[PDB]
Design a protein around this ligand. Structure first.
Ligand SMILES: Nc1ccn([C@H]2CC[C@@H](COP(=O)(O)OP(=O)(O)OP(=O)(O)O)O2)c(=O)n1
Ligand SMILES: [Mg+2]
Ligand SMILES: [Mg+2]
Length: 539
DNA sequence: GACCACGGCGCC
DNA sequence: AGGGCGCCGTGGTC
């Protein structure tokens, strides 16, 4: 079936390529091929051959299209079997597996990659026949979103490198005072970054009670959660918690980011993986910029490093209580839909409760703390953890949970139907019909089954919120382009854009609107917008 | 070097 | 008897 034709391929051919590395913005185009009909074209000079393509269709299209943009070519990504398969089963996340599961082997030869894309797409397209909903999501959301993600990856984000460079030396000194004291307290040095070594010290040398064990190995845990419980037992516990904060921030953001600045751009270029999560959410790789610090003071100092190009502004937009809103529409609960119809904020109300202060006294970080209480309790958190979290009597934690769901009656009924259907159907789905398979919903082991159940009914909520953000990006991108503004990052229910100073407001105004009206629900979708020279200030 | 499991933890 | 991610060291491989 496979013949070999001279490079020049016919329009609509399936691309096949090989990079020196995973990152499109950093990689070297080692090989470029194409497959169409029954023939296969191997470009003798890849980079140069890229100028020939009208579009990138095939496994990981967006990736070669990011390279193209990096090279000055506006090569947009088109059909990509990974998206088709990802939609059929979100557990389809790598070419390797999609190929073994659908008709081929993922190799290192571009030509074979081009052939495989063609045949893989044929199979998978057949599979989508009759799946009007998956076809809708593919054609109306994913395929076009892939293009958006490529421009985003190619564009990147500006970072105050000199700023992080000095920040390092500074905390490096604070980490020394903390480890120097932790060692004194223990009465001798040891690797503080070694959970095993600290375990021995905390539980064997000192006489601290072991409050928990680790999952796969069963070792006594030394988690922040355990350390919190032990904070009052020994002076060495607080010192260790602070050390862990600093070292985590410094080793994960403070030190690595400046070293990832691209030479040709001077900006940071993260990957936005389109087929990596079970719920339909994107993910950020290599630099993972979807988890930049924001909670603690040093975390905030780190976020400030993310800045706009001079004369530009960072416009940050974030849907409000997004998953509580999605849930009011999915559940159809009147109490909850009214909550939003009345402009109430459950994070503020829960935070007002937690800290026992009027609503107007709740500050940003206090409200943020409530988020983990609201989403945790919604998604199955237990009274024990709740109490052990809010540091309240187990009984008072039970009451908060009891009342939480009593206040929103239709939610449990919805969670119930979602699970039932998941058991029968074999999968759960989002508002737009994105599916996630949860076979374990019928496991005999209560442990496994109940855990499956929790991931099961979370998917529709989490996934619908993602479908929504993805639609908004697809809708918003063309207008920003028309406005000379750029889309830099997506943080699940937040978008970080960059717009010319003289246009920053019109852009914030527009994006906010596109986002809020993406797909009308039983509840309004509110978006808080912020503008500033840096990410922290934007929010 | 490269890469793995595991614990641990940053954000959503 | 919260869900979804990816990255960083520590140990231990190859
Ligand atoms: N602990 C968390 C935090 C967030 N999320 C999910 C649900 C909300 C979504 C986006 O997170 P945020 O923007 O931090 O939350 P939000 O509830 O939309 O609230 P707001 O933007 O009003 O602070 O991610 C979650 O499952 N668990
Ligand atoms: Mg939000
Ligand atoms: Mg957010």
């Amino acid at each position: 079936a496979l013949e070999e034709a001279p490079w020049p391929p016919p329009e609509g051919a399936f691309v096949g390529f090989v990079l020196s590395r995973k990152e499109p913005m950093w990689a070297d185009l080692l090989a470029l091929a194409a497959a169409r009909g029954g023939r296969v074209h191997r470009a003798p000079e890849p980079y140069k051959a890229l100028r020939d393509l009208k579009e990138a269709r095939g496994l990981l299209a967006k990736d070669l299209s990011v390279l193209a943009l990096r090279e000055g070519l506006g090569l947009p990504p088109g059909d990509d079997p990974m998206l088709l398969a990802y939609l059929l089963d979100p557990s389809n996340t790598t070419p390797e597996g999609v190929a073994r599961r659908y008709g081929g082997e993922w190799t290192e030869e571009a030509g074979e990659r081009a052939a495989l894309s063609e045949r893989l797409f044929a199979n998978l397209w057949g599979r989508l026949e009759g799946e009007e909903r998956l076809l809708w999501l593919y054609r109306e959301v994913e395929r076009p979103l892939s293009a958006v993600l490529a421009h985003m990856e190619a564009t990147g984000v500006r970072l105050d490198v000199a700023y992080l460079r000095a920040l390092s030396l500074e905390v490096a000194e604070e980490i020394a005072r903390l480890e120097a004291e932790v060692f004194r307290l223990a009465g001798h040095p040891f690797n503080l970054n070694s959970r095993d070594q600290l375990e021995r010290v905390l539980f064997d040398e000192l006489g601290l009670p072991a409050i928990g064990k680790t999952e796969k190995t069963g070792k006594r845990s030394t988690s922040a959660a355990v350390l919190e419980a032990l904070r009052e037992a020994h002076p060495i516990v607080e010192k260790i918690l602070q050390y862990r904060e600093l070292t985590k921030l410094k080793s994960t953001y403070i030190d690595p980011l400046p070293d990832l600045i691209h030479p040709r751009t001077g900006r940071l270029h993260t990957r936005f993986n389109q087929t990596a999560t079970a719920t339909g959410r994107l993910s950020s790789s290599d630099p993972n910029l979807q988890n930049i610090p924001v909670r603690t003071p040093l975390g905030q100092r780190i976020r400030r490093a993310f800045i706009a190009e001079e004369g530009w502004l960072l416009v940050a937009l974030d849907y409000s209580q997004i998953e509580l809103r999605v849930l009011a529409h999915l559940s159809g609960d009147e109490n909850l839909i009214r909550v939003f119809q009345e402009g109430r904020d459950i994070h503020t109300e829960t935070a007002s409760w937690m800290f026992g202060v009027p609503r107007e006294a709740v500050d940003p970080l206090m409200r943020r703390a409530a988020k983990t209480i609201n989403f945790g309790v919604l998604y199955g958190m237990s009274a024990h953890r709740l109490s052990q979290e809010l540091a309240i009597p187990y009984e008072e934690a039970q009451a908060f949970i009891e009342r939480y769901f009593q206040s929103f009656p239709k939610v449990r009924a919805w969670i119930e139907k979602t699970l039932e259907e998941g058991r029968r159907r074999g999968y759960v789905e989002t508002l737009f019909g994105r599916r996630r398979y949860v076979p374990d919903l019928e496991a005999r082991v209560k442990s496994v089954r109940e855990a499956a159940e929790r991931m099961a009914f979370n998917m529709p909520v989490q996934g619908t919120a993602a479908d929504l953000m993805k639609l908004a990006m697809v809708k918003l991108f063309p207008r920003l382009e028309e406005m000379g503004a750029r889309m830099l990052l997506q943080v699940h229910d937040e978008l970080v854009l960059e717009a010319p100073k003289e246009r920053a407001e019109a852009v914030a105004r527009l994006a906010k609107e596109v986002m809020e009206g993406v797909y009308p629900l039983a509840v309004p979708l509110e978006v808080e917008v912020g503008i500033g020279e840096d990410w922290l200030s934007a929010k």
